[PDB]
From a paper:
Both genome packaging and release from the capsid require a unique portal channel occupying one of the 12 capsid vertices. Recent symmetry-relaxed cryo-EM reconstruction strategies of α- and γ-herpesviral virions provided first snapshots of the unique portal vertex that is essential for DNA encapsidation and release.
By contrast, pORF19KCTD assembled as pentamers in 3 independent crystal forms with either a single pentamer or 2 pentamers per asymmetric unit. The pentamer has an outer diameter of approximately 142 Å, a central cavity of approximately 14 Å that is slightly narrower than the diameter of a double-stranded DNA helix (approximately 20 Å) and lateral interactions that bury an area of approximately 1,049 Å2 (±44.5 Å2) on one protomer and approximately 1,147 Å2 (±53.1 Å2) on the adjacent protomer. These inter-protomer main chain β-interactions are likely to confer extra stability to the pentamer. Our crystal structure also reveals that each protomer binds 2 acetate ions via 4 intra-protomeric hydrogen bonds (acetate622) and 3 salt bridges (acetate623), respectively. One of these acetate ions (acetate623) connects 2 adjacent protomers via polar interactions with the side chain of Gln458 of the adjacent protomer, thereby further stabilizing the pentameric interactions.
Author numbering:
A (entry chain J): 126 to 319, 329 to 398, 408 to 453, 459 to 550
B (entry chain H): 126 to 319, 330 to 397, 407 to 453, 457 to 550
C (entry chain E): 126 to 319, 330 to 399, 405 to 453, 458 to 550
D (entry chain D): 126 to 319, 329 to 397, 407 to 453, 457 to 550
E (entry chain A): 126 to 319, 330 to 453, 457 to 550
């Protein structure tokens, strides 16, 4: 079950057993006499905060944290936590993965707007994904009027739950009323209340079985799908005019430094995302068909968590931006409380949805995204941005002896 | 509950959860292969003495103390002890914090001398604090006659107690008679014995009916006078301060300490105005009951050092007397856990600070003596270093582990 | 029972108690303040993978693995596992070692083609081994037609067993039908079904009456063919070898590795087959005189490693973060150091042997086998010349000294 | 209770709580990543021997001993043991400290030889100490005839006891008969047997109470006083023509190296000792009035222990442990065995070995020359500055880089 | 009870409490941040082998063994084992030390061949030892005929015992028949079977009446012959020795090893008159052998010259010409078995058998050394190849120390 992925054109292909991040990071702690990895300003601040926490797992407090680095246990557990943000923890047969729901939405929209035949197999959902996303995004840019990319809650108890309260299948009437992406797809005829044709239901009943109900009747799949679609929209927008051939002076990632002996015309608009879709998204989903969108692009999740936080020069010594990640780590490594871990997972997911709304509500979303990746994660070019979305960090080698 | 502070103009703002010193210092021990922090001559002498002590907490004797540095546990426990100098340990409803009592005194004095409206909210107490302090100080400089900034004790048992003996509400008649700051405020009509009491009008409007008049329950008057002395010394030290210039003797280098985490001259009083608006006010908005020792621990340390200030010429100080009060608190709370002995140790540190504040304020040029102590014992060479030393209680530097 | 071996001409002789690899490697961890050994790209990838394994023996995870090196326990246990690839674990009196079976085959073929007298003693089997191998190889090169160097399985359960299924003495009819080396020896009259059987005349004169004819009990024929493939690859690799030249890409430096233990041009070049003749007379013969039952994997573990790597062989730059190439070695290590399950260890040993046979077929099926072999030794093991290739075949690695302080 | 001392002119004053050696040495182990202290050839040999001893306290065998240095526990316990050499361990009201007895002897001798009034207070005993010692020494140099600076024992059991045997107040008649210093003071009329005026008794009854008996009646004070006087005589003689202003090429002690951030007309004869007496001896005795002479000058005690050793001519490597036996036995008895009687015997052996070595030093034709040789060869001292500091510290520490 | 020794002329004298090797070696582990000792190729091979042994005492496997050195516990226990090779472990009143028996033999031979009066005191035994050895050796060189320096065993059980089997006082008739040294002394009239017995006259005057005649109780004769072989090899090795000149291949550097402990002062003249034949051994006899025996009168010959014992153990091993790497552990088996028996198993009988095996291996190697056509030449080759000794200075110090330590910087 070995699979191969490639992130940017001209770069090497990576053959992995299961997970690229999980198999790449440990290899950076094998030359501890000469160098140790560093994962950027945000991870340096995370490491500083983690070592000060009164309640924090002892196994994540290894000596490497005090040597201008982050221990392997701390960096891998942090990245795993981020990758599980949009994973489904409700044991429900009516549920699709957020990635599958997002793919059904963008494919139904494409069939409604073009004369293209409805997708037959899950492979057809991923075929021409850059073109399907490009059509949805160019129409979303033309969506004038008030509203943002947020869900409307009218109660604090309602906000603390991912699913509708009192075991209901639908969210209250106001829930999606202010969401621009939902409004555009609703106007196009998707997810209707019922005999109005439901393209999403025709796709779900042909590939994902009879158990998946119409998105308007059981609205969890609509909410999860919208949020995963926001991640794909941000990923497309960030790489839209990307170029990687040029050796940028501010390029942080150096695979020759990190890998050592293990390593052996301009791009048109949308070509960098097409490469990542064909060589990374498709092989990742072929190996892990139920992968959440947070597993595909953990860098977008991290940038969204950072967008919530956003006068002059400033030093951030606060730990609030690490609270959701640290609570999951404390619940699964120290307290082992299954209920408290489920609540911690909900808090991380809600914080990400809040940050995604900040990113998409900005007048130029890729500009804010570029600023966060540069300031908090050290990414200076399109090559760094593409690798950061996939890895969740941009590791560098720093000599142990100066 | 995150809050932001700024110490000097042009410098970065620091966002902290609760405490700047407590959150900044641990970050200096995260590159132990390349460098370790050093906190100045006084802390180098403290570290030398602490490792020689027969009775000293074992957790404060970590290996970093023997590597041209001071361990994180030793430096943070020392700074916490200094920051708690004027903290209230009597559980009394009639008590204000020393900072609140000092603010009531300086605000009542300002209303008496200017006829400006009495402060309504605790925010009004801090509004125009540099101007309120400047009026009190310029009048204190004109206070001619004998007397100093000390309390008069007529018994050794009386000296060993912070509150009046035999559970009394007032101190003996001689207690405040030699204090110039008390005498000036008494002559102005503040805290009268019953006559309009401006302090009581302020305390009953913001701090409740439980706070008695300062003349009836004199603990608040004594604590307020001492905290006011710390604010006076802080204002005087920064009075003609400039930070724009990159001084050759500037010890503090935040670019070195923080790494990846990081024109018109200032008029008289402008450096203190910046520290009041960007540090004092946000600190008190987050911790309304903060003692004056938590706001400016550097003044407390300079006061403890002023007591020490005999033969002229070169001299090596291998004595531990200047660390006795801090070390006794550390021994009582980390090793012996004796509640009574810890309370006596806390009183001894507070009395030693009051003794040193009197030395500082009795000097003909108080900021000059203050500058000398900050330079010799703490390594501070300019106004930038002095402002940061008052806030941090030290001036950390990075020293390479390998030479 | 001390014995002496020499690998290449002009180099020192090594006196060992039992095993050269096992006695040489520990001596590289005796200057840990100044330097630590490094065993090449394949072992660097192995070390990376071993430290990531959820189930892996704790004693093999020492600190040296994280200091640009491989711990002594990990490198020695890996090399021992490779050296035991073709060791016989069936306690059977009808069984020869794969080396003995290969020697009987090449000697019977030589007598059939030259009419030289049949070998009388086990020493006669090894006498003129370069010449006996050279005759078999030059005839194998002339073997035109379809087929490769693989065994034909018609069932997955049949593939998972080394011996024939249902305790049978013969493999199914299709088993050897596609093997070129078997076909050439069968056409020459060797191992007939009963016709004079030269192999049986050799086995009954030196290895006792218990060894049955190769056509009747076919395990010895299968084991012998595979060991013969290893000897063929070893001969082909060193065929035009020269060691006198101090090559710029020579990785192995014994002066660096041994230090004070080692007491250190116009010389004529080695003729064709002379480098292999030196290794046969000074390494193969003394090794077999000391350990008569040594498997071919103990003689040349480097060929076994190159064969395991040949199975692995998208176009362009590539980073290999997979652990599949180490699965068989790691499973044996887990089964003998941690779980101590006799059945699971036997299955793991079978899997390593089958993977090696698969890789040997890739190496021999290549149009120029020594060229592919040279490429694998260079890319995965760092060997840049004939000196490195000869030492790699014997040691299973090419250790270098790397300074602990840069 | 903080006090200040100064060792040589032009050097800094040291403010200490109780003990200069005890407070200075720990400060040398605070930069262990860059440097460690080294205390000279004798201490290097001591460290080598201590680590080889089968019976030696484990707490004194720290890692610093194996890193071209001596651990803080080993160096401080060694120096404390040397400083306690002449400390009084008999709980007796009739006893003076050896320093007090030596001061009474030199002051009584000065009053007998000059018109000067008898000292009234203990401060008067120390007033003009260089001048009082100078008078006694110049008369001792004129003492012709046989005899040395040793006590005469006529029995091995008598040699193993500091006090007279069978609880007697006087030592046998032969005991002081060969001692030149005792003979000179006896001829001068000091300590008479009784109506002969006793100047020593007039001093002791005025400052040290009525419990101190006349030196001739209770002779322990006379024996202890004579030995402490020998230490003061050797200290005066060593620094008699000392100069410190000159920066000598062979000066080992470098206080700028050791302390770091914590830190012309010639001296006339006796001026270097006058400085050490006024700025070190007097403030030390004002803070610790009952200090033994071994606490004031432990370097003289160490040089005396080394003088016993001083067989074959030429280059020589000393791998013996005999010179450390007395110090090591005290360390074993107080840190490991805790045997009160054996510790008392070990203390007596160290004191008797010191008395034996002081006799070797004073019997040499040029005592400061032998003293200079020992301080140079065993302790690394190359000039008067080093010699003055060695007498006070008992060693001359140097900083040696951990990385070469 | 401190005593002083000197090994070569012009060098410093060493004052020790009891043992030079035991007191010198620990001083080399006191500067571990800058340097660590290295004891030569044989000890490097020993250290490599010791760390690979499945059965080996854990206390001898310290970290220093893995830092281009040998731990203090391993080097001192190895040297102590070698020094105890010929120590007497039979609690018998009829027994002399092998050194005392060798001295009685060489003194009786000297009295038989010269007009010299029989020695009266144990000091007279050591007086003129170079001259007494020189007379015995020059006569041994003239001993023509077959035979070597070995004992003849006619049974494997007989070979496994140091003393005669079945509690007998005499060895079988064939035992000494092939030994050239025994044959020469027997022809001279020494140890007769009862004829005047010069050896018995010496033993009964200095070592008491308990020592029986060498022909009646033959253990003293066997032990004495073997110790005499060690003295003969020591004399032969230093016979034409010179030390004044600073050789380029001189391994031992006492200035490096001792540092501040060594006061160099005045260095010897390299252009000074040469040492005459026997003068280097005379210096070692007067300044090392005599003071060592005055301090430890019952010292075995292996304690005086452990380097000869090590060279003898190495002589057994001595087939192919050229460069050679020795990865075998056979040469360390006898030493390692003693170490395992006294530090790990604590079996009194097995330790006694291990001690016998080391003594028999040494006797076998001494025969190889003395049977070589030029014994000092083979001895020089072994000291150079296995112990790093390149000159007479190194050879004299190697005989005494059992090794030639060098300082190697921890940081290169």
């Amino acid at each position: 079950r070995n699979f191969t992925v490639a992130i940017v054109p001209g770069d090497p292909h990576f053959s992995v057993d299961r997970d690229l991040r999980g198999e790449l990071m440990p290899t950076l702690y094998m030359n501890q006499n000469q160098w140790l990895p560093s994962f950027g300003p945000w991870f340096i601040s995370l490491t500083d905060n983690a070592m000060q926490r009164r309640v924090f797992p002892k196994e994540l407090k290894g000596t490497v944290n005090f040597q201008n680095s982050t221990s392997l246990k701390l960096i891998s557990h942090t990245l795993t936590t981020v990758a599980s943000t949009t994973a489904d923890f409700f044991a429900d047969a009516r549920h699709l993965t957020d990635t599958q729901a997002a793919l059904c939405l963008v494919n139904a929209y494409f069939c409604q707007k073009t004369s293209r035949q409805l997708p037959a197999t899950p492979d057809d959902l991923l075929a021409d994904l850059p073109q399907k996303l490009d059509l949805l995004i160019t129409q979303l840019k033309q969506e004038s009027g008030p509203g943002d990319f947020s869900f409307t809650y009218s109660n604090p108890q309602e906000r603390a739950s991912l699913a509708p309260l009192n075991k209901e299948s639908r969210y209250p009437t106001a829930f999606f009323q202010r969401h621009k992406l939902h409004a555009m797809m609703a106007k196009a005829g998707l997810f209707p209340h019922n005999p109005a044709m439901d393209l999403v239901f025709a796709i779900t009943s042909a590939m994902f079985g009879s158990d998946i109900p119409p998105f308007s009747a059981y609205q969890w799949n609509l909410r999860a799908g919208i949020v995963a679609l926001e991640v794909f929209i941000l990923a497309y927008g960030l790489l839209e005019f990307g170029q990687v051939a040029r050796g940028h002076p501010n390029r942080r990632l150096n695979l020759v430094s990190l890998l050592g002996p293990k390593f052996q015309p301009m791009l048109k608009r949308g070509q960098l995302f097409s490469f990542i879709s064909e060589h990374y998204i498709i092989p990742t989903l072929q190996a892990n068909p139920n992968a959440p969108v947070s597993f595909i692009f953990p860098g977008i999740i991290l940038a969204a968590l950072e967008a919530r936080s956003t006068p002059g020069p400033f030093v951030n010594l606060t730990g609030s931006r690490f609270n959701e990640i640290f609570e999951i780590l404390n619940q699964q490594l120290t307290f082992r409380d299954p209920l408290a871990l489920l609540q911690a997972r909900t808090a991380l997911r809600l914080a990400t949805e809040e940050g995604l709304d900040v990113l998409l509500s900005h007048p130029s979303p890729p500009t804010l995204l570029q600023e966060i990746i540069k300031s908090q994660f050290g990414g200076g070019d399109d090559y760094d941005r593409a690798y950061f979305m996939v890895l969740g960090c941009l590791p560098v080698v720093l000599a142990v002896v100066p």
